[PDB]
Amino acid sequence: SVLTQPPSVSGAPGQRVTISCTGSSSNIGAGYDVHWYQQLPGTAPKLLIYGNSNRPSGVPDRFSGSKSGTSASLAITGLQAEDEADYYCQSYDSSLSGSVFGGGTKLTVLGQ
Amino acid sequence: TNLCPFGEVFNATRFASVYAWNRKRISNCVADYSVLYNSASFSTFKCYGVSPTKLNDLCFTNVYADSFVIRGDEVRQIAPGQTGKIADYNYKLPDDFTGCVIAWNSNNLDSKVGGNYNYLYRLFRKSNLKPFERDISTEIYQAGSTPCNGVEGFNCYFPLQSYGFQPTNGVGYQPYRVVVLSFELLHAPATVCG
Amino acid sequence: QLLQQSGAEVKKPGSSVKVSCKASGGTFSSYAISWVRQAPGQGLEWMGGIIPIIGIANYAQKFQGRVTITADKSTSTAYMELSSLRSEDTAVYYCARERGYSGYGAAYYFDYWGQGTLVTVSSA
Amino acid sequence: STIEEQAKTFLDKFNHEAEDLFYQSSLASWNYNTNITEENVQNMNNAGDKWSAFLKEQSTLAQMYPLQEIQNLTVKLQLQALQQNGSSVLSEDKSKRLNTILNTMSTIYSTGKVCNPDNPQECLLLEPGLNEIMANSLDYNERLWAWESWRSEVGKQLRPLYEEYVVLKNEMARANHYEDYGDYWRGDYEVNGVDGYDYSRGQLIEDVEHTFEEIKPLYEHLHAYVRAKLMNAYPSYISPIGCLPAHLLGDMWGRFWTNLYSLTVPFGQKPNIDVTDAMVDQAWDAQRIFKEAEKFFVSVGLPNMTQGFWENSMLTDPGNVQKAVCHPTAWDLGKGDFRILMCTKVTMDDFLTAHHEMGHIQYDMAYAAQPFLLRNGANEGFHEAVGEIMSLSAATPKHLKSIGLLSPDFQEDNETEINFLLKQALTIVGTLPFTYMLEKWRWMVFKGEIPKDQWMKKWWEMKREIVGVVEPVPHDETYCDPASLFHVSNDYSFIRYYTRTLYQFQFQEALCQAAKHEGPLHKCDISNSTEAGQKLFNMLRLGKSEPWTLALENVVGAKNMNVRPLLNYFEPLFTWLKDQNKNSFVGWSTDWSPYAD
Ligand SMILES: *[C@@H]1O[C@H](CO)[C@@H](O)[C@H](O)[C@H]1NC(C)=O
Ligand SMILES: *[C@@H]1O[C@H](CO)[C@@H](O)[C@H](O)[C@H]1NC(C)=O
Ligand SMILES: *[C@@H]1O[C@H](CO)[C@@H](O)[C@H](O)[C@H]1NC(C)=O
Ligand SMILES: *[C@@H]1O[C@H](CO)[C@@H](O)[C@H](O)[C@H]1NC(C)=O
Ligand SMILES: *[C@@H]1O[C@H](CO)[C@@H](O)[C@H](O)[C@H]1NC(C)=O
């Protein structure tokens, strides 16, 4: 996977966690827009954050995306038990002529 | 202290279609423009706002390199203040455009007998584009007042039509690959010098 | 009401899977329908895609030559004829759609992904 | 939104589909005509019917746009050529009968043959069988037999077909809101909705009957002089005051009289200008004939040939391995691929057709900027007329001396020019009453002014009145003498050979006037005069986006077809023929016939 993304994050419920999607000069830094995805375990993944900072029909307001140059940030506020999922950033790539994904972050809440 | 990779933009054997024109950033590198203007085999090389000799000793913060395939007669529409099927619907340059427009014939690479139907162009769009705005929507163009529900028919047309390039097509309709450079300045320190 | 996709598969190396993807719903014959892979326990990978109102087929440079993606607009069903890969081909194969918003930037899928066909290649 | 802007959207979608499908319909019909193989017949009829059904696909989708709510005429001319549905307005019972008869009448023409009566197993086709007889034999009865046999074999077999051909094609046109099928042909010349430039479909009959009344001074002396020379070569057969026999007219029908140049030459000991020998002595090949034809159009400021013209065209007969249909045609395949398919022999005749068929290519290159339904001549007669004025300007002795095919010591005098214009008048002036006879015949057939028991009767009453040609054998209604021709049997409008003639001399005079030419009109080359080239190119770039009367005024300053540029051309010949006819009758009596004993 081209889009560099950390292995996993860990936070508290009620805390704010941020997930980085760092690309290259051909995929994110070149003005193409990232897209974030939510995979609950054993489920088909869905649209999380639309069009680099937007939302699809049916997602809470806790998730928000952004982009600064050759990076991205999946801002998640107020972690939940239904937020334990895997998070894949999609940003189209120029040299590959195809839409490449990211490394995937397992979100683990704490308390037990 | 790296050289700017203009070559892997120029040596790419797959340029994207004009509707999904392809954007590569060129930064954090010292730039050798001297191999570009000295090539002298392009069919169109315009610079807009800067002389080609002077820009070698000139510092920029980011260089965006657009690259796509259009038709021969439609090379004239890649210029600030032009209209047509490419400027309005496919790729719009700003009026205050500060980059260079590079184009070369590729009848030989990008056409084949029977038609190279791989290169697409958005033949219809409701509103016209902003500068550098990309429309990759395959959504059915509602030509009329009856809603289409996303099928084709009367006043319901598909926007992305295909260039059919044969190598026997005339010089006005041979596929001229185009690489549009674009230069910008900010309060950031300059990463592209030469 | 979402999408239809064929059931799970078990295959031998050298055989070929033609996993279908029926218009789970909404517009079809006028939308780019891609294919995204996920090896179990691994990250997602795009595979290819078609615009099933023309027949153009882009593929990744990794999956080139093996997968072929086609659709018949009369039956509103896509197809993903993978030729053969040995043993790391075992992966769940979703069937995403493609909207393509205008502006800056590029493809997000729909939210419409298939339920997930797990094609396992093995010799046992 | 509005009906106009939806039509601007439809024709924006129609063009970029019709550019591609017409290219494959042409590029496959190219590959047939360069290489006659049965594999290429299939690709000709695959891509040819993917185009022929695409017109039927887009004719029905265009009739959902009413023309009344369309204001822009450049949009409205595209739909008017598209919303016409042609033969598809008929029932499919009548349509499949109709397409049968066309392929029935074509095979009786193209594959029918005649047989000499003493040896019934060897037989004669028309091409090149009866054409070599009717153009090169000098016997009376050999031409008399070849006249009758093609009109008794092929003439009988087309008559019950041509009866049904009239009735079906009327209902093809009467359902198209046209008063007959003769009015369907005249809808190419029609202009509507441009003030000062409108032209009704019946205004044509008002012109073609009017312009022919002033060729009758030129023609009836040409008819008198040729009859005077053929009375000398056929003494017991041609009256001094009667009409001509039909089989003594240079070919089967009397279309051209070019083959009567030998029998009726003005000055039989003067040399005819023929640079065939000088092209051999300078060792020109067919590449050189087209490089000189390119440089002809460079001289008048027209753009030279594209690089895809030289790479892709057939300019020489490619050996004997593969066969090609060697008729010189100019191929606009569309999309900048302009080609001439010509089996050029190095002569002067394929030096003249060299500039002719490239004249069509120079015509087709100029309106490539027009959208697809406007990529044609402004009528049916400009397209063949733009090519022919490039062959008159190359046939001049001033042009041949300029390129070294004619020696600089060659003498122009009175007698070579009369030998030249009489060679032109048997080709050009000779085909004008035949073309006016045949199309006024069809227009009285399709309107129903001739009953079906009098088609053969009124035919030879039009021959003895208009042209001056008497039949040697009396014909009842069992024959169909008109359909013996190519253009009558195979559903072609033939008035495009009258109007094209009267346009080319308008085009010649109004560019010689633009070339500031001093002297007679037939001594005029248009070369090196870019003001005579930029004048013509402003007509050529229109296509048919503007009406044909406006494109005609962009050259000649007149809105109408006119014979005063024709009579200006043959004015040194018109004065000469009257002096020659000082002891011969001018005109013809309608009563004498060869079968009157
Ligand atoms: C493309 O490759 C060529 C050699 O094939 C070389 O000049 C360079 O790496 C590239 N071209 C440019 C202009 O950088
Ligand atoms: C003509 O056609 C035949 C078969 O269609 C082919 O074998 C031959 O090569 C063609 N001629 C040329 C010159 O290509
Ligand atoms: C007719 O339409 C064409 C484009 O289809 C346009 O260029 C032209 O200006 C229009 N005519 C008028 C009178 O507006
Ligand atoms: C036509 O003439 C121009 C002017 O000399 C020349 O530049 C061009 O190359 C010529 N066309 C061809 C196909 O050689
Ligand atoms: C046209 O001009 C060229 C160059 O001036 C000259 O060589 C040629 O003879 C001229 N031809 C005619 C017909 O005037």
PDB file of C-alpha atoms in Angstrom, chain D residues 125-327:
ATOM      1  CA  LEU D 125     -21.431  -6.724 -71.979  1.00  0.00           C
ATOM      2  CA  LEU D 126     -21.906  -2.974 -71.912  1.00  0.00           C
ATOM      3  CA  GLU D 127     -18.536  -2.245 -70.282  1.00  0.00           C
ATOM      4  CA  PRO D 128     -16.200  -2.635 -72.013  1.00  0.00           C
ATOM      5  CA  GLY D 129     -18.133  -4.500 -74.688  1.00  0.00           C
ATOM      6  CA  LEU D 130     -20.755  -2.136 -76.073  1.00  0.00           C
ATOM      7  CA  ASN D 131     -18.746   0.906 -74.995  1.00  0.00           C
ATOM      8  CA  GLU D 132     -15.904  -0.089 -77.325  1.00  0.00           C
ATOM      9  CA  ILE D 133     -18.469  -0.560 -80.095  1.00  0.00           C
ATOM     10  CA  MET D 134     -20.408   2.672 -79.647  1.00  0.00           C
ATOM     11  CA  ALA D 135     -17.294   4.832 -79.190  1.00  0.00           C
ATOM     12  CA  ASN D 136     -14.851   3.389 -81.721  1.00  0.00           C
ATOM     13  CA  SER D 137     -16.742   1.631 -84.516  1.00  0.00           C
ATOM     14  CA  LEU D 138     -17.525   3.637 -87.632  1.00  0.00           C
ATOM     15  CA  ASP D 139     -19.973   1.183 -89.224  1.00  0.00           C
ATOM     16  CA  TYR D 140     -23.631   2.185 -89.383  1.00  0.00           C
ATOM     17  CA  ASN D 141     -25.160  -1.220 -88.651  1.00  0.00           C
ATOM     18  CA  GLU D 142     -22.640  -2.214 -85.971  1.00  0.00           C
ATOM     19  CA  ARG D 143     -23.660   0.906 -84.066  1.00  0.00           C
ATOM     20  CA  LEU D 144     -27.295   0.300 -85.067  1.00  0.00           C
ATOM     21  CA  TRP D 145     -27.250  -3.250 -83.707  1.00  0.00           C
ATOM     22  CA  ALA D 146     -25.507  -2.194 -80.493  1.00  0.00           C
ATOM     23  CA  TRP D 147     -28.103   0.554 -80.031  1.00  0.00           C
ATOM     24  CA  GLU D 148     -31.092  -1.750 -80.440  1.00  0.00           C
ATOM     25  CA  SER D 149     -29.798  -4.829 -78.601  1.00  0.00           C
ATOM     26  CA  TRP D 150     -29.045  -3.063 -75.308  1.00  0.00           C
ATOM     27  CA  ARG D 151     -32.476  -1.448 -75.593  1.00  0.00           C
ATOM     28  CA  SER D 152     -34.197  -4.723 -76.487  1.00  0.00           C
ATOM     29  CA  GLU D 153     -32.462  -6.952 -73.947  1.00  0.00           C
ATOM     30  CA  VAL D 154     -31.982  -4.589 -70.997  1.00  0.00           C
ATOM     31  CA  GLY D 155     -34.682  -2.213 -72.237  1.00  0.00           C
ATOM     32  CA  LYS D 156     -37.511  -4.736 -71.954  1.00  0.00           C
ATOM     33  CA  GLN D 157     -36.349  -6.179 -68.628  1.00  0.00           C
ATOM     34  CA  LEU D 158     -36.515  -2.812 -66.880  1.00  0.00           C
ATOM     35  CA  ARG D 159     -39.906  -1.571 -68.127  1.00  0.00           C
ATOM     36  CA  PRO D 160     -42.286  -3.446 -65.744  1.00  0.00           C
ATOM     37  CA  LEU D 161     -39.779  -2.698 -62.990  1.00  0.00           C
ATOM     38  CA  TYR D 162     -39.637   1.003 -63.814  1.00  0.00           C
ATOM     39  CA  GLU D 163     -43.435   1.193 -63.790  1.00  0.00           C
ATOM     40  CA  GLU D 164     -43.453   0.014 -60.176  1.00  0.00           C
ATOM     41  CA  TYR D 165     -40.354   2.126 -59.458  1.00  0.00           C
ATOM     42  CA  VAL D 166     -42.321   5.310 -60.127  1.00  0.00           C
ATOM     43  CA  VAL D 167     -45.338   4.327 -58.018  1.00  0.00           C
ATOM     44  CA  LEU D 168     -43.369   3.280 -54.934  1.00  0.00           C
ATOM     45  CA  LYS D 169     -41.005   6.260 -54.918  1.00  0.00           C
ATOM     46  CA  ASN D 170     -43.911   8.685 -55.228  1.00  0.00           C
ATOM     47  CA  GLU D 171     -45.476   7.319 -52.029  1.00  0.00           C
ATOM     48  CA  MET D 172     -41.967   7.454 -50.585  1.00  0.00           C
ATOM     49  CA  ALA D 173     -42.056  11.191 -51.294  1.00  0.00           C
ATOM     50  CA  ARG D 174     -45.770  11.960 -50.909  1.00  0.00           C
ATOM     51  CA  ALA D 175     -45.540  10.764 -47.317  1.00  0.00           C
ATOM     52  CA  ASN D 176     -42.587  13.166 -47.006  1.00  0.00           C
ATOM     53  CA  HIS D 177     -44.892  16.115 -47.881  1.00  0.00           C
ATOM     54  CA  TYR D 178     -43.435  16.335 -51.400  1.00  0.00           C
ATOM     55  CA  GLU D 179     -45.741  16.489 -54.403  1.00  0.00           C
ATOM     56  CA  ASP D 180     -43.854  13.693 -56.215  1.00  0.00           C
ATOM     57  CA  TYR D 181     -40.433  12.087 -56.186  1.00  0.00           C
ATOM     58  CA  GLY D 182     -39.201  14.583 -58.763  1.00  0.00           C
ATOM     59  CA  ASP D 183     -39.769  17.176 -56.060  1.00  0.00           C
ATOM     60  CA  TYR D 184     -37.694  15.025 -53.700  1.00  0.00           C
ATOM     61  CA  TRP D 185     -34.636  15.434 -55.933  1.00  0.00           C
ATOM     62  CA  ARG D 186     -35.198  19.184 -56.199  1.00  0.00           C
ATOM     63  CA  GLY D 187     -35.084  19.516 -52.406  1.00  0.00           C
ATOM     64  CA  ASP D 188     -31.301  19.720 -52.577  1.00  0.00           C
ATOM     65  CA  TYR D 189     -31.584  23.046 -54.424  1.00  0.00           C
ATOM     66  CA  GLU D 190     -34.251  24.356 -52.053  1.00  0.00           C
ATOM     67  CA  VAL D 191     -33.522  27.351 -49.842  1.00  0.00           C
ATOM     68  CA  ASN D 192     -36.042  28.458 -47.219  1.00  0.00           C
ATOM     69  CA  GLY D 193     -36.178  31.235 -44.683  1.00  0.00           C
ATOM     70  CA  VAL D 194     -33.346  33.506 -45.838  1.00  0.00           C
ATOM     71  CA  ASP D 195     -34.758  36.735 -47.258  1.00  0.00           C
ATOM     72  CA  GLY D 196     -33.406  37.663 -50.666  1.00  0.00           C
ATOM     73  CA  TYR D 197     -31.972  34.156 -51.019  1.00  0.00           C
ATOM     74  CA  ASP D 198     -35.009  31.846 -50.861  1.00  0.00           C
ATOM     75  CA  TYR D 199     -35.445  29.391 -53.696  1.00  0.00           C
ATOM     76  CA  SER D 200     -38.536  27.259 -54.143  1.00  0.00           C
ATOM     77  CA  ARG D 201     -38.311  23.727 -55.475  1.00  0.00           C
ATOM     78  CA  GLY D 202     -40.358  24.829 -58.489  1.00  0.00           C
ATOM     79  CA  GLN D 203     -38.077  27.802 -59.134  1.00  0.00           C
ATOM     80  CA  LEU D 204     -35.565  25.252 -60.452  1.00  0.00           C
ATOM     81  CA  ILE D 205     -37.901  24.211 -63.280  1.00  0.00           C
ATOM     82  CA  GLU D 206     -38.336  27.937 -63.915  1.00  0.00           C
ATOM     83  CA  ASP D 207     -34.542  28.261 -64.228  1.00  0.00           C
ATOM     84  CA  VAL D 208     -33.532  25.050 -66.022  1.00  0.00           C
ATOM     85  CA  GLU D 209     -36.133  25.704 -68.700  1.00  0.00           C
ATOM     86  CA  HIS D 210     -35.002  29.338 -68.942  1.00  0.00           C
ATOM     87  CA  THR D 211     -31.232  28.840 -69.120  1.00  0.00           C
ATOM     88  CA  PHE D 212     -31.600  26.179 -71.799  1.00  0.00           C
ATOM     89  CA  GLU D 213     -33.371  28.626 -74.122  1.00  0.00           C
ATOM     90  CA  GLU D 214     -30.123  30.569 -74.502  1.00  0.00           C
ATOM     91  CA  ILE D 215     -27.899  27.548 -75.121  1.00  0.00           C
ATOM     92  CA  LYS D 216     -30.161  26.853 -78.128  1.00  0.00           C
ATOM     93  CA  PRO D 217     -28.259  29.473 -80.179  1.00  0.00           C
ATOM     94  CA  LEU D 218     -24.964  27.724 -79.358  1.00  0.00           C
ATOM     95  CA  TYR D 219     -26.228  24.161 -79.529  1.00  0.00           C
ATOM     96  CA  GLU D 220     -28.251  24.334 -82.749  1.00  0.00           C
ATOM     97  CA  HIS D 221     -25.141  25.429 -84.616  1.00  0.00           C
ATOM     98  CA  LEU D 222     -23.169  22.680 -82.874  1.00  0.00           C
ATOM     99  CA  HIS D 223     -25.975  20.335 -83.882  1.00  0.00           C
ATOM    100  CA  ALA D 224     -25.761  21.704 -87.420  1.00  0.00           C
ATOM    101  CA  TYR D 225     -21.984  21.422 -87.779  1.00  0.00           C
ATOM    102  CA  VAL D 226     -21.769  17.882 -86.391  1.00  0.00           C
ATOM    103  CA  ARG D 227     -24.646  16.826 -88.656  1.00  0.00           C
ATOM    104  CA  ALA D 228     -22.834  18.433 -91.590  1.00  0.00           C
ATOM    105  CA  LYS D 229     -19.668  16.447 -90.895  1.00  0.00           C
ATOM    106  CA  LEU D 230     -21.533  13.213 -90.195  1.00  0.00           C
ATOM    107  CA  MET D 231     -23.583  13.545 -93.360  1.00  0.00           C
ATOM    108  CA  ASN D 232     -20.183  13.319 -95.062  1.00  0.00           C
ATOM    109  CA  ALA D 233     -19.231  10.170 -93.133  1.00  0.00           C
ATOM    110  CA  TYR D 234     -22.694   8.545 -93.289  1.00  0.00           C
ATOM    111  CA  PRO D 235     -24.049   9.592 -96.682  1.00  0.00           C
ATOM    112  CA  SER D 236     -27.148   7.437 -97.198  1.00  0.00           C
ATOM    113  CA  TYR D 237     -28.279   7.743 -93.583  1.00  0.00           C
ATOM    114  CA  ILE D 238     -28.404  11.350 -92.307  1.00  0.00           C
ATOM    115  CA  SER D 239     -30.749  14.035 -93.667  1.00  0.00           C
ATOM    116  CA  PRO D 240     -29.278  17.517 -94.254  1.00  0.00           C
ATOM    117  CA  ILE D 241     -32.241  19.112 -92.429  1.00  0.00           C
ATOM    118  CA  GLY D 242     -33.439  16.265 -90.196  1.00  0.00           C
ATOM    119  CA  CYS D 243     -32.299  15.078 -86.798  1.00  0.00           C
ATOM    120  CA  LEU D 244     -29.373  12.857 -85.882  1.00  0.00           C
ATOM    121  CA  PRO D 245     -29.641   9.083 -85.446  1.00  0.00           C
ATOM    122  CA  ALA D 246     -29.224   8.118 -81.809  1.00  0.00           C
ATOM    123  CA  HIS D 247     -26.522   5.524 -82.388  1.00  0.00           C
ATOM    124  CA  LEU D 248     -24.168   7.971 -84.140  1.00  0.00           C
ATOM    125  CA  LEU D 249     -23.592  10.064 -81.031  1.00  0.00           C
ATOM    126  CA  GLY D 250     -20.305   8.867 -79.559  1.00  0.00           C
ATOM    127  CA  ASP D 251     -21.715   6.343 -77.091  1.00  0.00           C
ATOM    128  CA  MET D 252     -24.826   4.294 -76.319  1.00  0.00           C
ATOM    129  CA  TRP D 253     -27.139   7.128 -75.286  1.00  0.00           C
ATOM    130  CA  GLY D 254     -25.815  10.405 -76.641  1.00  0.00           C
ATOM    131  CA  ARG D 255     -24.684  11.665 -73.248  1.00  0.00           C
ATOM    132  CA  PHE D 256     -21.277  12.884 -74.400  1.00  0.00           C
ATOM    133  CA  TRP D 257     -20.135  13.564 -77.943  1.00  0.00           C
ATOM    134  CA  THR D 258     -16.386  13.489 -77.151  1.00  0.00           C
ATOM    135  CA  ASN D 259     -15.983  10.372 -79.279  1.00  0.00           C
ATOM    136  CA  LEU D 260     -17.202  12.329 -82.328  1.00  0.00           C
ATOM    137  CA  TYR D 261     -14.119  14.568 -82.203  1.00  0.00           C
ATOM    138  CA  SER D 262     -12.295  12.466 -84.792  1.00  0.00           C
ATOM    139  CA  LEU D 263     -15.129  12.407 -87.332  1.00  0.00           C
ATOM    140  CA  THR D 264     -16.023  16.095 -86.880  1.00  0.00           C
ATOM    141  CA  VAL D 265     -12.610  17.741 -86.289  1.00  0.00           C
ATOM    142  CA  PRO D 266     -12.332  21.426 -87.348  1.00  0.00           C
ATOM    143  CA  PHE D 267      -8.759  21.432 -88.634  1.00  0.00           C
ATOM    144  CA  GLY D 268      -7.823  17.810 -89.302  1.00  0.00           C
ATOM    145  CA  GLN D 269      -4.161  18.493 -90.093  1.00  0.00           C
ATOM    146  CA  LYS D 270      -3.392  20.782 -87.168  1.00  0.00           C
ATOM    147  CA  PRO D 271      -1.795  18.991 -84.201  1.00  0.00           C
ATOM    148  CA  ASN D 272      -3.935  18.528 -81.126  1.00  0.00           C
ATOM    149  CA  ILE D 273      -2.284  19.653 -77.910  1.00  0.00           C
ATOM    150  CA  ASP D 274      -1.227  16.424 -76.211  1.00  0.00           C
ATOM    151  CA  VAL D 275       1.601  16.498 -73.683  1.00  0.00           C
ATOM    152  CA  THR D 276       1.387  12.742 -73.120  1.00  0.00           C
ATOM    153  CA  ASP D 277       4.634  12.317 -75.048  1.00  0.00           C
ATOM    154  CA  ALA D 278       6.457  15.062 -73.149  1.00  0.00           C
ATOM    155  CA  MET D 279       5.546  13.496 -69.806  1.00  0.00           C
ATOM    156  CA  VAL D 280       7.090  10.250 -71.040  1.00  0.00           C
ATOM    157  CA  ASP D 281      10.190  12.025 -72.371  1.00  0.00           C
ATOM    158  CA  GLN D 282      10.637  13.890 -69.093  1.00  0.00           C
ATOM    159  CA  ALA D 283      10.011  10.526 -67.346  1.00  0.00           C
ATOM    160  CA  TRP D 284       7.192  11.628 -65.076  1.00  0.00           C
ATOM    161  CA  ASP D 285       5.559   9.084 -62.791  1.00  0.00           C
ATOM    162  CA  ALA D 286       2.181   9.370 -61.075  1.00  0.00           C
ATOM    163  CA  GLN D 287       3.903  10.850 -58.027  1.00  0.00           C
ATOM    164  CA  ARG D 288       5.116  13.760 -60.167  1.00  0.00           C
ATOM    165  CA  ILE D 289       1.662  14.340 -61.697  1.00  0.00           C
ATOM    166  CA  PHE D 290       0.294  14.933 -58.201  1.00  0.00           C
ATOM    167  CA  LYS D 291       3.226  17.038 -57.009  1.00  0.00           C
ATOM    168  CA  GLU D 292       2.521  19.376 -59.915  1.00  0.00           C
ATOM    169  CA  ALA D 293      -1.179  19.322 -59.055  1.00  0.00           C
ATOM    170  CA  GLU D 294      -0.333  20.215 -55.454  1.00  0.00           C
ATOM    171  CA  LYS D 295       1.805  23.115 -56.681  1.00  0.00           C
ATOM    172  CA  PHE D 296      -1.139  24.306 -58.777  1.00  0.00           C
ATOM    173  CA  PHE D 297      -3.102  24.849 -55.577  1.00  0.00           C
ATOM    174  CA  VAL D 298      -0.110  26.336 -53.769  1.00  0.00           C
ATOM    175  CA  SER D 299      -0.032  28.988 -56.513  1.00  0.00           C
ATOM    176  CA  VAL D 300      -3.635  30.095 -55.871  1.00  0.00           C
ATOM    177  CA  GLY D 301      -3.010  30.281 -52.128  1.00  0.00           C
ATOM    178  CA  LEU D 302      -5.170  27.219 -51.318  1.00  0.00           C
ATOM    179  CA  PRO D 303      -3.554  24.934 -48.720  1.00  0.00           C
ATOM    180  CA  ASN D 304      -1.437  22.096 -50.048  1.00  0.00           C
ATOM    181  CA  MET D 305      -2.161  18.424 -49.408  1.00  0.00           C
ATOM    182  CA  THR D 306      -1.911  16.995 -45.926  1.00  0.00           C
ATOM    183  CA  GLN D 307       0.879  14.545 -45.163  1.00  0.00           C
ATOM    184  CA  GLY D 308      -1.758  11.837 -44.828  1.00  0.00           C
ATOM    185  CA  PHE D 309      -2.667  12.374 -48.469  1.00  0.00           C
ATOM    186  CA  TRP D 310       0.679  11.098 -49.690  1.00  0.00           C
ATOM    187  CA  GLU D 311       1.151   8.269 -47.196  1.00  0.00           C
ATOM    188  CA  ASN D 312      -2.301   6.773 -47.547  1.00  0.00           C
ATOM    189  CA  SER D 313      -3.721   7.311 -51.034  1.00  0.00           C
ATOM    190  CA  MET D 314      -3.555   4.979 -54.012  1.00  0.00           C
ATOM    191  CA  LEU D 315      -1.780   6.987 -56.685  1.00  0.00           C
ATOM    192  CA  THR D 316      -0.508   4.098 -58.848  1.00  0.00           C
ATOM    193  CA  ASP D 317      -2.032   0.758 -59.806  1.00  0.00           C
ATOM    194  CA  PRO D 318      -0.346  -1.527 -57.229  1.00  0.00           C
ATOM    195  CA  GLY D 319       0.777  -4.268 -59.593  1.00  0.00           C
ATOM    196  CA  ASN D 320      -1.367  -7.146 -60.778  1.00  0.00           C
ATOM    197  CA  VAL D 321      -1.567  -9.127 -57.514  1.00  0.00           C
ATOM    198  CA  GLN D 322      -4.425  -7.213 -55.894  1.00  0.00           C
ATOM    199  CA  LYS D 323      -7.266  -5.627 -57.846  1.00  0.00           C
ATOM    200  CA  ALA D 324      -8.674  -2.147 -57.299  1.00  0.00           C
ATOM    201  CA  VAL D 325     -11.693  -0.350 -58.733  1.00  0.00           C
ATOM    202  CA  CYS D 326      -9.662   2.108 -60.795  1.00  0.00           C
ATOM    203  CA  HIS D 327     -12.325   4.771 -61.267  1.00  0.00           C
TER     204      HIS D 327
END
